[PDB]
Design a binder for these strands. Sequence first.
DNA 1: GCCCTGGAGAATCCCGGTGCCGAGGCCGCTCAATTGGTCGTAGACAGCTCTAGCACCGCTTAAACGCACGTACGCGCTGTCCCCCGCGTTTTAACCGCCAAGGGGATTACTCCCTAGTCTCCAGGCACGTGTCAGATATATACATCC
DNA 2: GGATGTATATATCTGACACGTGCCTGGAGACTAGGGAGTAATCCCCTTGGCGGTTAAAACGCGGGGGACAGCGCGTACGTGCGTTTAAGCGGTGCTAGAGCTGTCTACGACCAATTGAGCGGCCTCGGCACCGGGATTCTCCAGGGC
Lengths: 93, 93, 108, 108, 4, 4, 82, 81, 97, 98
Amino acid sequence: SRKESYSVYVYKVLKQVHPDTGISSKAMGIMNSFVNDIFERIAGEASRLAHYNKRSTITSREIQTAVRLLLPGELAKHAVSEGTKAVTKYTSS
Amino acid sequence: SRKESYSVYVYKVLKQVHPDTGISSKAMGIMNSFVNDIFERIAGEASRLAHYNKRSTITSREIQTAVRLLLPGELAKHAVSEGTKAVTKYTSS
Amino acid sequence: ARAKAKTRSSRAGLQFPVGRVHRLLRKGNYAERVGAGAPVYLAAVLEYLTAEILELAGNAARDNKKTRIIPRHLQLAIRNDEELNKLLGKVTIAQGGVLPNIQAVLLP
Amino acid sequence: ARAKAKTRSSRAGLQFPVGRVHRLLRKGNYAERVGAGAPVYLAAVLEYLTAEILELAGNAARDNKKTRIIPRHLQLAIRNDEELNKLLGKVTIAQGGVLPNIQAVLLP
Amino acid sequence: RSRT
Amino acid sequence: RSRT
Amino acid sequence: KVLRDNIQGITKPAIRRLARRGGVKRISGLIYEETRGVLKVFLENVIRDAVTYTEHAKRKTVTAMDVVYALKRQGRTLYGFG
Amino acid sequence: VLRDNIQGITKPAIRRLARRGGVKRISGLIYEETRGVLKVFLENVIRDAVTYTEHAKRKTVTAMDVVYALKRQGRTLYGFG
Amino acid sequence: PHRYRPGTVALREIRRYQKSTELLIRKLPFQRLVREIAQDFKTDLRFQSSAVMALQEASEAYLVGLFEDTNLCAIHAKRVTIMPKDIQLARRIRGER
Amino acid sequence: KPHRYRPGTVALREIRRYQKSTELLIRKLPFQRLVREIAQDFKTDLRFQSSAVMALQEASEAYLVGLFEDTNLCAIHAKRVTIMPKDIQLARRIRGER
DNA sequence: GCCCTGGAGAATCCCGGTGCCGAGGCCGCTCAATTGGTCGTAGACAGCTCTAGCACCGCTTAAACGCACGTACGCGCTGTCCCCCGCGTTTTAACCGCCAAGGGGATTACTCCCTAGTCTCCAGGCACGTGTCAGATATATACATCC
DNA sequence: GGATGTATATATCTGACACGTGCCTGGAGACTAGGGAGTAATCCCCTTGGCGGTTAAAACGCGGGGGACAGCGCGTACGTGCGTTTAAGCGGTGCTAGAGCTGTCTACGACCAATTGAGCGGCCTCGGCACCGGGATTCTCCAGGGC
């Protein structure tokens, strides 16, 4: 069997902010755990929000509200701006 | 629109352990909240257990394991015995 | 032909509903499919816990010469145990008050 | 006659996958239906957070003359902030150590 | 306890 | 911070 | 009309009554400002989440369920209001 | 069988842990309390892990069972999968 | 005159207030304070009465628990009077700061 | 006269040394034996992977270090430098573990 | 007699040579992400009703405010004796390296029983009215408790 | 001993709890088609058990300096009581913003068949990092001088 991870994407992101820095395997395991944890938190909060209002679909509004509920401080503002920019760029084409 | 609660069943249970005692409305609301909270806890734990093992169904064994994980001490033993008796009586007839 | 209808809760000898619990489980987004013995087990557990709470609260109410149960009696019953206090250790009860105690050093 | 295949990540200008997140959302039992804009938003947020953590960790690694990144540098980067210390305040990092500090009263 |  |  | 300087409505006797119910015997003179600050921080933290929940539903009235959910988000479950 | 292995947590190890914790001076009755606390914590975690491994009809306790048992009590751990 | 010795009426008050179950804060000032605080995040907001009641109950419970912990901390250091440092230590240990 | 450091000087050096490293501070064989003994009660004839024992050791180390930090704060609050059992008891009571 | 004022031994830092194991790049290839169409329902949007949230005024009294006086408590200074720190020598078991055997985890085929999906019908649970009793209130003892 | 606060007995009276009822939405009974889970057989990876040598770490003992703890005195800050002032609570009117329900229909997401490029598993190699040794600089503790 073959497993799945986020190794290649983490390496791609790292090669953009520090073009001459490597990473070991233990740090990669920690990064995978971090990504999984954040994904689970946001998805669960979005599901609960959708369930409260008697809806049966998950849209970008639910994700935005979940992000504003979870992340603290200026992280919320930056993440919201990045998400809105990405969605607009995707739907323009 | 008509809603639903657990008032009638709580009253029926109360009329077996104290046949000369009543209950007010606020205590009934508290009992409703308690029942809903416990139901949600057990159901969520059972769903997580079923997801961990690559299964796609919820049976009495997941419920039993969730009860063992949630309730502390002698409450777990008594609840397990009661559930097993109920299931075997239901199956026998 | 169809015989007389018999409720599942009656067939299992319970007081709590079984069809309602099955419907809630099916519509709560918990799993793709739900078995047949889960509702009976869950209803039995819920009934047992409710009976425990109600018996203790009724004893507390009858202690001080009262006929009806009020949230103060429920709070006393929950806080005065050892295993119910652990199960509900992060729950606030409206109009419940506190448990009467005073530190020994403060007392004269 | 089919046009050239173009990944959704490239169409949205991201590095993190979008099809994989969509599949995970569909198969995670979160809701009956999933919209078409949720994966893009989620991938963008995840990429932003990852970039934040990696930049701070790289600064910490370069601080004491090293080329690679080890869990100690990640722990230093996380604990030395104020927002990331609040988001990950109940998380243990293996082989991370502790922040060096000593109470002033103990010092001679 | 109860219901033993 | 980083990217706005 | 705007509202200003209402934190002084939590008077000293009310704080004394709360301390008495808590079991305290003697109170110093600088406790009251600390108590007011702590209460203000707690109230801001809860009300922010309640207002976010209200906004998501496209409403203009804050209900009791929003407060209940906001409290539940911090491990402070409350029984009685639904 | 095995017995009284709680004495394997020697006094120098507790001293090293206290030193990493920032402590400067230690009394002589600390060690027994620390051993009791550690025993209670281990008992809770191991009980949860064994329940998890028994539900799946297995005879080996894996790392994922320990990770789940820790995450259950608000003790998320990173780096073991 | 029958002036009681200091610290005698305090025990009577402790016994009295640990037996009742009502609210210990006036309602109108609390409602005004809640409205003032909520004015920052949004404008032209309307509240149900039960919402303000729930907020008051939660605040009461939180403050009483904090005062219990503060009393424990004050007793630990061979004192009877509670001081701001006790509140700060209790909040630091509990994880709120 | 032999060179002797004044009391409380080697303690600060030990603190500075142990707050800079990342290795484990407990022997592995005694810990493994203790874990097996404790698990004996719940079930018999059990097997453990090495990674499970490693995870348990890491978690226990972190828990004990945090508890000792809180205990030191409690001890300092009462005008002392020596930690005592009542400080551990007070920290565990306030944290909600008892 | 005191406040410094240099030396000595131990601890920490810095620099150069080395060799070895893990991080980083390259190649088949196979499973999962893409492109194009179709259909049936979830959610957007406009309009009407009536519940409940906001604004105002007068009055009666319970609670907050202000000032005085005296005593119980917090805090600083001293002295003594037990307990924990620093160091040298002896004894125990952790740790590393290598071998061997068998229990138990992981993967494949297949066959049957358990649960989802439909249609009908009829009884259990909800909304609505109401008459009576458990509980709250007021007042006169009367006994437990503080200075 | 006696003022003050606490426990107790009795008429009564109003609002909330328990009981009755019509009916309509959700639960029950019978049948069926297809995929999920139970069961037998097999391969090989990972856990358990054992032996020997060496060297790092644990255990035991002893002198003494610093810290925990008890005791006493004094002066300020907090508790108790009284007369005066402010605004919370209660009851009642009147107006309208906004929550909650209903009918239509259109755009959006689930589902299926083919096609192909992105990501996973498997060898290979060289440079970043760990280890060693010697020399230069730093930190601590006790001995002396004259201000």
